Amino acid sequence: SRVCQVTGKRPVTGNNRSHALNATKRRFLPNLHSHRFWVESEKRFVTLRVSAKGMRVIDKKGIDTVLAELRARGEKY
Amino acid sequence: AAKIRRDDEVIVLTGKDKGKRGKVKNVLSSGKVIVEGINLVKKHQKPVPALNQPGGIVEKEAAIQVSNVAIFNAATGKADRVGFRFEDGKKVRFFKSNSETI
Amino acid sequence: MIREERLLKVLRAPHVSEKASTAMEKSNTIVLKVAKDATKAEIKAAVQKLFEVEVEVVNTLVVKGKVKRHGQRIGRRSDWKKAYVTLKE
Amino acid sequence: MKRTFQPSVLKRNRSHGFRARMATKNGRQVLARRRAKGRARLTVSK
Protein backbone atom coordinates (compact mmCIF):
# COMPACT_ATOMS: atom_id res chain seq x y z
CA SER A 1 0.00 0.00 0.00
CA ARG A 2 1.24 3.52 0.80
CA VAL A 3 3.97 2.34 3.15
CA CYS A 4 7.57 3.48 3.40
CA GLN A 5 9.41 0.19 3.01
CA VAL A 6 12.46 1.24 5.00
CA THR A 7 10.97 3.28 7.84
CA GLY A 8 7.33 2.28 7.99
CA LYS A 9 5.38 5.50 7.64
CA ARG A 10 1.71 4.54 7.58
CA PRO A 11 -0.64 7.24 6.29
CA VAL A 12 -2.12 8.66 9.46
CA THR A 13 -5.38 10.51 9.95
CA GLY A 14 -6.09 13.88 11.41
CA ASN A 15 -8.54 16.68 11.92
CA ASN A 16 -8.49 19.61 9.53
CA ARG A 17 -9.18 22.73 11.58
CA SER A 18 -10.26 25.86 9.73
CA HIS A 19 -10.12 29.39 11.10
CA ALA A 20 -13.47 28.88 12.84
CA LEU A 21 -12.18 25.55 14.26
CA ASN A 22 -14.60 23.49 12.17
CA ALA A 23 -13.31 19.92 12.23
CA THR A 24 -13.16 17.86 9.04
CA LYS A 25 -11.51 14.45 8.86
CA ARG A 26 -8.50 14.28 6.53
CA ARG A 27 -5.56 11.99 5.83
CA PHE A 28 -1.84 12.67 6.12
CA LEU A 29 0.14 10.95 3.35
CA PRO A 30 3.91 10.40 3.50
CA ASN A 31 6.42 11.59 0.90
CA LEU A 32 6.66 8.19 -0.76
CA HIS A 33 9.01 7.90 -3.71
CA SER A 34 10.10 4.87 -5.72
CA HIS A 35 13.86 4.82 -6.02
CA ARG A 36 16.42 2.73 -7.86
CA PHE A 37 19.44 2.15 -5.64
CA TRP A 38 22.86 0.79 -6.49
CA VAL A 39 24.44 -1.89 -4.32
CA GLU A 40 28.04 -2.84 -5.06
CA SER A 41 27.57 -5.98 -2.96
CA GLU A 42 24.84 -7.27 -5.26
CA LYS A 43 26.45 -4.97 -7.89
CA ARG A 44 23.06 -4.00 -9.35
CA PHE A 45 20.04 -1.73 -9.10
CA VAL A 46 17.19 -2.46 -6.67
CA THR A 47 13.77 -0.81 -6.50
CA LEU A 48 12.42 0.45 -3.17
CA ARG A 49 9.52 2.66 -2.14
CA VAL A 50 10.89 5.07 0.44
CA SER A 51 10.25 8.50 1.91
CA ALA A 52 12.68 11.39 2.11
CA LYS A 53 13.38 10.66 5.77
CA GLY A 54 13.93 7.09 4.64
CA MET A 55 16.24 8.42 1.94
CA ARG A 56 18.29 10.19 4.59
CA VAL A 57 18.46 6.91 6.52
CA ILE A 58 19.84 5.33 3.32
CA ASP A 59 22.35 8.18 3.20
CA LYS A 60 23.51 7.78 6.80
CA LYS A 61 23.81 4.04 7.46
CA GLY A 62 24.88 1.67 4.71
CA ILE A 63 22.42 0.21 2.22
CA ASP A 64 23.77 -3.27 2.96
CA THR A 65 22.65 -2.72 6.57
CA VAL A 66 19.16 -1.46 5.71
CA LEU A 67 18.72 -4.36 3.30
CA ALA A 68 19.53 -6.90 6.02
CA GLU A 69 17.12 -5.17 8.38
CA LEU A 70 14.46 -5.31 5.64
CA ARG A 71 15.19 -9.03 5.39
CA ALA A 72 14.85 -9.20 9.17
CA ARG A 73 11.35 -7.81 8.73
CA GLY A 74 10.95 -10.42 5.97
CA GLU A 75 10.01 -7.77 3.41
CA LYS A 76 10.66 -7.51 -0.34
CA TYR A 77 13.46 -5.51 -1.92
CA ALA B 1 -29.45 -52.01 43.82
CA ALA B 2 -33.17 -52.80 43.63
CA LYS B 3 -34.57 -54.11 46.89
CA ILE B 4 -37.40 -56.25 45.47
CA ARG B 5 -36.70 -58.67 42.62
CA ARG B 6 -38.62 -61.03 40.38
CA ASP B 7 -39.48 -64.31 42.11
CA ASP B 8 -40.03 -62.77 45.57
CA GLU B 9 -43.20 -63.16 47.67
CA VAL B 10 -44.37 -59.76 48.86
CA ILE B 11 -47.20 -57.97 50.65
CA VAL B 12 -48.59 -54.54 49.83
CA LEU B 13 -48.77 -51.78 52.47
CA THR B 14 -50.95 -49.03 50.95
CA GLY B 15 -53.96 -50.03 48.90
CA LYS B 16 -57.43 -51.46 49.02
CA ASP B 17 -55.84 -54.92 49.16
CA LYS B 18 -53.57 -54.06 52.11
CA GLY B 19 -52.31 -57.02 54.11
CA LYS B 20 -52.73 -59.39 51.17
CA ARG B 21 -49.74 -61.11 49.67
CA GLY B 22 -48.57 -62.62 46.41
CA LYS B 23 -45.72 -63.41 44.06
CA VAL B 24 -44.15 -60.85 41.72
CA LYS B 25 -44.55 -61.54 38.01
CA ASN B 26 -42.68 -58.58 36.58
CA VAL B 27 -40.76 -55.42 37.42
CA LEU B 28 -41.12 -52.61 34.90
CA SER B 29 -38.78 -49.74 34.14
CA SER B 30 -41.16 -47.18 35.64
CA GLY B 31 -40.77 -48.32 39.23
CA LYS B 32 -43.90 -50.46 39.32
CA VAL B 33 -44.37 -54.16 40.03
CA ILE B 34 -47.08 -56.60 39.03
CA VAL B 35 -48.34 -58.89 41.79
CA GLU B 36 -50.60 -61.86 41.11
CA GLY B 37 -54.14 -61.78 42.48
CA ILE B 38 -53.69 -58.36 44.10
CA ASN B 39 -54.46 -55.64 41.55
CA LEU B 40 -57.42 -56.67 39.40
CA VAL B 41 -58.67 -54.32 36.69
CA LYS B 42 -61.64 -54.94 34.38
CA LYS B 43 -60.53 -54.24 30.84
CA HIS B 44 -63.25 -53.65 28.25
CA GLN B 45 -61.35 -55.39 25.49
CA LYS B 46 -62.36 -54.22 22.02
CA PRO B 47 -61.68 -57.37 19.97
CA VAL B 48 -59.74 -57.12 16.71
CA PRO B 49 -60.69 -59.62 13.96
CA ALA B 50 -57.29 -60.76 12.67
CA LEU B 51 -56.20 -62.23 16.03
CA ASN B 52 -57.98 -64.21 18.76
CA GLN B 53 -61.26 -62.43 19.54
CA PRO B 54 -62.39 -62.56 23.17
CA GLY B 55 -64.60 -59.52 23.35
CA GLY B 56 -66.07 -59.39 26.82
CA ILE B 57 -64.89 -57.91 30.09
CA VAL B 58 -61.46 -59.44 30.67
CA GLU B 59 -59.33 -59.29 33.81
CA LYS B 60 -55.74 -58.16 34.00
CA GLU B 61 -53.23 -57.50 36.77
CA ALA B 62 -52.32 -53.83 36.86
CA ALA B 63 -49.25 -52.25 38.40
CA ILE B 64 -48.57 -50.94 41.89
CA GLN B 65 -45.41 -49.14 42.94
CA VAL B 66 -42.23 -50.69 44.30
CA SER B 67 -42.47 -48.39 47.32
CA ASN B 68 -45.92 -49.72 48.20
CA VAL B 69 -44.99 -53.40 48.27
CA ALA B 70 -42.69 -54.87 50.90
CA ILE B 71 -40.92 -58.21 51.12
CA PHE B 72 -42.69 -60.72 53.32
CA ASN B 73 -40.22 -62.08 55.84
CA ALA B 74 -42.01 -65.50 55.77
CA ALA B 75 -40.85 -66.27 59.33
CA THR B 76 -42.18 -63.34 61.33
CA GLY B 77 -45.66 -63.10 59.84
CA LYS B 78 -45.36 -59.50 58.60
CA ALA B 79 -43.24 -57.23 56.41
CA ASP B 80 -39.60 -56.22 56.81
CA ARG B 81 -37.14 -53.77 55.30
CA VAL B 82 -34.23 -55.30 53.39
CA GLY B 83 -30.64 -54.16 53.06
CA PHE B 84 -27.57 -55.10 51.07
CA ARG B 85 -24.83 -56.83 53.03
CA PHE B 86 -21.52 -58.12 51.76
CA GLU B 87 -21.61 -61.87 52.17
CA ASP B 88 -18.97 -63.88 50.15
CA GLY B 89 -17.87 -61.98 47.16
CA LYS B 90 -21.29 -61.44 45.57
CA LYS B 91 -23.21 -58.59 47.23
CA VAL B 92 -26.41 -60.04 48.67
CA ARG B 93 -29.72 -58.95 50.17
CA PHE B 94 -30.59 -59.60 53.80
CA PHE B 95 -33.61 -58.97 56.00
CA LYS B 96 -33.23 -56.14 58.48
CA SER B 97 -34.28 -56.36 62.16
CA ASN B 98 -32.91 -59.94 62.39
CA SER B 99 -29.66 -61.29 60.94
CA GLU B 100 -31.15 -63.34 58.11
CA THR B 101 -29.93 -63.65 54.53
CA ILE B 102 -32.70 -64.27 52.01
CA MET C 1 -11.71 -57.78 -2.49
CA ILE C 2 -14.51 -55.40 -1.54
CA ARG C 3 -15.80 -55.74 -5.12
CA GLU C 4 -17.39 -59.04 -4.11
CA GLU C 5 -18.60 -57.26 -0.96
CA ARG C 6 -19.99 -54.47 -3.16
CA LEU C 7 -21.94 -56.80 -5.45
CA LEU C 8 -23.22 -58.65 -2.39
CA LYS C 9 -24.23 -55.28 -0.94
CA VAL C 10 -26.01 -53.83 -3.99
CA LEU C 11 -29.18 -55.89 -4.38
CA ARG C 12 -31.80 -55.27 -1.69
CA ALA C 13 -35.21 -56.68 -2.60
CA PRO C 14 -37.07 -58.33 -5.47
CA HIS C 15 -40.01 -56.17 -6.44
CA VAL C 16 -43.60 -57.41 -6.61
CA SER C 17 -46.17 -55.38 -8.54
CA GLU C 18 -48.69 -55.64 -11.36
CA LYS C 19 -46.39 -54.08 -13.95
CA ALA C 20 -43.64 -56.25 -12.46
CA SER C 21 -45.64 -59.44 -13.02
CA THR C 22 -46.69 -58.31 -16.50
CA ALA C 23 -43.14 -57.55 -17.64
CA MET C 24 -41.94 -60.77 -15.98
CA GLU C 25 -44.39 -62.95 -17.89
CA LYS C 26 -43.95 -61.02 -21.15
CA SER C 27 -40.23 -60.50 -21.67
CA ASN C 28 -38.68 -62.59 -18.81
CA THR C 29 -37.50 -59.41 -17.06
CA ILE C 30 -37.30 -59.28 -13.27
CA VAL C 31 -37.72 -56.07 -11.26
CA LEU C 32 -35.48 -55.31 -8.32
CA LYS C 33 -35.10 -52.61 -5.71
CA VAL C 34 -31.38 -51.91 -5.34
CA ALA C 35 -29.04 -49.58 -3.47
CA LYS C 36 -28.84 -45.83 -4.01
CA ASP C 37 -25.73 -45.55 -6.17
CA ALA C 38 -25.94 -49.07 -7.67
CA THR C 39 -24.87 -48.60 -11.30
CA LYS C 40 -25.90 -50.64 -14.35
CA ALA C 41 -22.75 -52.75 -14.63
CA GLU C 42 -22.62 -53.44 -10.90
CA ILE C 43 -26.27 -54.52 -10.91
CA LYS C 44 -25.70 -56.82 -13.91
CA ALA C 45 -22.56 -58.30 -12.37
CA ALA C 46 -24.33 -58.77 -9.04
CA VAL C 47 -27.32 -60.63 -10.49
CA GLN C 48 -25.02 -62.77 -12.66
CA LYS C 49 -22.98 -63.59 -9.55
CA LEU C 50 -25.76 -64.16 -7.04
CA PHE C 51 -28.71 -65.66 -8.90
CA GLU C 52 -26.46 -67.53 -11.41
CA VAL C 53 -28.45 -66.56 -14.51
CA GLU C 54 -28.01 -64.90 -17.89
CA VAL C 55 -28.51 -61.16 -18.51
CA GLU C 56 -28.97 -59.14 -21.69
CA VAL C 57 -29.28 -55.52 -20.45
CA VAL C 58 -30.51 -53.58 -17.43
CA ASN C 59 -32.80 -50.53 -17.32
CA THR C 60 -32.39 -48.32 -14.26
CA LEU C 61 -34.61 -45.61 -12.78
CA VAL C 62 -34.65 -43.46 -9.66
CA VAL C 63 -38.04 -42.88 -8.06
CA LYS C 64 -38.84 -40.30 -5.38
CA GLY C 65 -40.87 -41.41 -2.38
CA LYS C 66 -43.96 -39.30 -1.85
CA VAL C 67 -44.09 -36.45 0.67
CA LYS C 68 -46.55 -37.82 3.21
CA ARG C 69 -48.19 -36.12 6.18
CA HIS C 70 -48.68 -37.68 9.60
CA GLY C 71 -50.77 -35.44 11.80
CA GLN C 72 -48.85 -32.26 11.13
CA ARG C 73 -45.39 -33.68 10.47
CA ILE C 74 -44.42 -33.73 6.81
CA GLY C 75 -42.14 -36.64 5.97
CA ARG C 76 -40.55 -37.29 2.62
CA ARG C 77 -39.95 -41.02 2.31
CA SER C 78 -36.83 -42.78 1.09
CA ASP C 79 -35.27 -42.45 -2.35
CA TRP C 80 -34.72 -45.85 -3.91
CA LYS C 81 -33.58 -47.19 -7.28
CA LYS C 82 -35.45 -49.78 -9.34
CA ALA C 83 -33.88 -51.85 -12.12
CA TYR C 84 -35.51 -54.04 -14.77
CA VAL C 85 -33.16 -56.89 -15.68
CA THR C 86 -33.90 -58.60 -19.00
CA LEU C 87 -32.73 -62.20 -18.72
CA LYS C 88 -32.16 -64.43 -21.71
CA GLU C 89 -34.77 -67.02 -22.64
CA MET D 1 -50.95 -7.78 -14.44
CA LYS D 2 -47.31 -8.91 -14.43
CA ARG D 3 -46.30 -9.40 -10.82
CA THR D 4 -42.86 -8.82 -9.38
CA PHE D 5 -41.85 -12.45 -8.82
CA GLN D 6 -41.45 -14.16 -12.20
CA PRO D 7 -39.33 -16.98 -10.91
CA SER D 8 -36.44 -19.01 -12.32
CA VAL D 9 -34.07 -21.28 -10.41
CA LEU D 10 -30.93 -20.12 -12.19
CA LYS D 11 -31.03 -16.46 -11.18
CA ARG D 12 -32.32 -17.52 -7.76
CA ASN D 13 -29.44 -19.89 -7.07
CA ARG D 14 -26.95 -17.54 -8.71
CA SER D 15 -27.88 -14.58 -6.55
CA HIS D 16 -29.05 -16.06 -3.26
CA GLY D 17 -27.30 -19.41 -3.46
CA PHE D 18 -24.86 -20.91 -1.02
CA ARG D 19 -21.69 -20.51 -3.05
CA ALA D 20 -22.44 -16.92 -4.02
CA ARG D 21 -22.58 -16.16 -0.31
CA MET D 22 -19.51 -18.21 0.60
CA ALA D 23 -17.39 -16.57 -2.10
CA THR D 24 -18.01 -13.17 -0.48
CA LYS D 25 -16.92 -11.87 2.92
CA ASN D 26 -20.25 -10.28 3.88
CA GLY D 27 -21.91 -13.40 2.55
CA ARG D 28 -19.96 -15.47 5.06
CA GLN D 29 -20.99 -12.95 7.71
CA VAL D 30 -24.64 -13.41 6.69
CA LEU D 31 -24.28 -17.18 6.90
CA ALA D 32 -22.65 -16.91 10.32
CA ARG D 33 -25.56 -14.80 11.59
CA ARG D 34 -28.01 -17.31 10.09
CA ARG D 35 -26.24 -20.15 11.89
CA ALA D 36 -25.90 -18.30 15.20
CA LYS D 37 -29.61 -17.51 15.23
CA GLY D 38 -30.02 -21.11 14.16
CA ARG D 39 -32.33 -21.27 11.18
CA ALA D 40 -33.22 -24.65 9.73
CA ARG D 41 -33.06 -23.95 6.01
CA LEU D 42 -29.91 -21.88 5.89
CA THR D 43 -30.16 -20.31 2.45
CA VAL D 44 -31.98 -21.13 -0.73
CA SER D 45 -29.59 -23.74 -2.07
CA LYS D 46 -32.23 -26.53 -1.81
Partner: protein, 63 residues
Protein backbone atom coordinates in the same frame (compact mmCIF):
# COMPACT_ATOMS: atom_id res chain seq x y z
CA UNK E 1 -19.48 -64.92 17.28
CA UNK E 2 -18.06 -64.56 20.80
CA UNK E 3 -15.12 -62.20 20.69
CA UNK E 4 -12.16 -64.34 21.81
CA UNK E 5 -13.42 -67.08 19.48
CA UNK E 6 -12.68 -64.68 16.66
CA UNK E 7 -9.49 -63.46 18.37
CA UNK E 8 -7.80 -66.81 17.89
CA UNK E 9 -8.63 -66.95 14.19
CA UNK E 10 -6.48 -66.37 11.10
CA UNK E 11 -6.82 -63.72 8.44
CA UNK E 12 -7.64 -65.69 5.28
CA UNK E 13 -10.29 -67.59 7.24
CA UNK E 14 -11.49 -64.22 8.55
CA UNK E 15 -11.97 -63.09 4.95
CA UNK E 16 -13.77 -66.27 3.87
CA UNK E 17 -16.03 -66.12 6.91
CA UNK E 18 -16.68 -62.43 6.16
CA UNK E 19 -17.86 -63.36 2.68
CA UNK E 20 -19.94 -66.23 4.06
CA UNK E 21 -21.51 -63.81 6.55
CA UNK E 22 -22.33 -61.41 3.72
CA UNK E 23 -23.89 -64.17 1.60
CA UNK E 24 -25.86 -65.32 4.66
CA UNK E 25 -26.95 -61.68 5.10
CA UNK E 26 -28.11 -61.51 1.51
CA UNK E 27 -30.21 -64.69 1.68
CA UNK E 28 -31.87 -63.44 4.86
CA UNK E 29 -32.73 -59.96 3.58
CA UNK E 30 -34.03 -61.45 0.33
CA UNK E 31 -36.31 -63.87 2.22
CA UNK E 32 -37.34 -61.04 4.54
CA UNK E 33 -38.37 -58.74 1.71
CA UNK E 34 -40.13 -61.69 0.04
CA UNK E 35 -42.47 -62.45 2.97
CA UNK E 36 -40.60 -65.22 4.81
CA UNK E 37 -38.61 -65.04 8.08
CA UNK E 38 -40.97 -65.43 10.97
CA UNK E 39 -37.80 -64.78 12.99
CA UNK E 40 -36.70 -61.34 11.80
CA UNK E 41 -34.14 -60.85 14.58
CA UNK E 42 -31.60 -63.14 12.85
CA UNK E 43 -30.99 -60.40 10.27
CA UNK E 44 -30.00 -57.93 12.99
CA UNK E 45 -27.50 -60.21 14.71
CA UNK E 46 -26.01 -61.17 11.34
CA UNK E 47 -25.12 -57.53 10.76
CA UNK E 48 -23.43 -57.39 14.17
CA UNK E 49 -21.30 -60.42 13.36
CA UNK E 50 -20.12 -58.74 10.16
CA UNK E 51 -19.07 -55.71 12.21
CA UNK E 52 -17.13 -57.88 14.64
CA UNK E 53 -15.19 -59.55 11.84
CA UNK E 54 -14.35 -56.24 10.21
CA UNK E 55 -13.14 -54.93 13.57
CA UNK E 56 -10.55 -57.67 13.65
CA UNK E 57 -9.71 -56.87 10.04
CA UNK E 58 -8.45 -53.54 11.36
CA UNK E 59 -6.61 -55.10 14.31
CA UNK E 60 -5.47 -58.59 13.34
CA UNK E 61 -4.06 -56.97 10.20
CA UNK E 62 -2.87 -53.71 11.71
CA UNK E 63 -3.91 -50.33 13.02
Amino acid sequence: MKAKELREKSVEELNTELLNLLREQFNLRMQAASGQLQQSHLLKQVRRDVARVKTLLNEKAGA
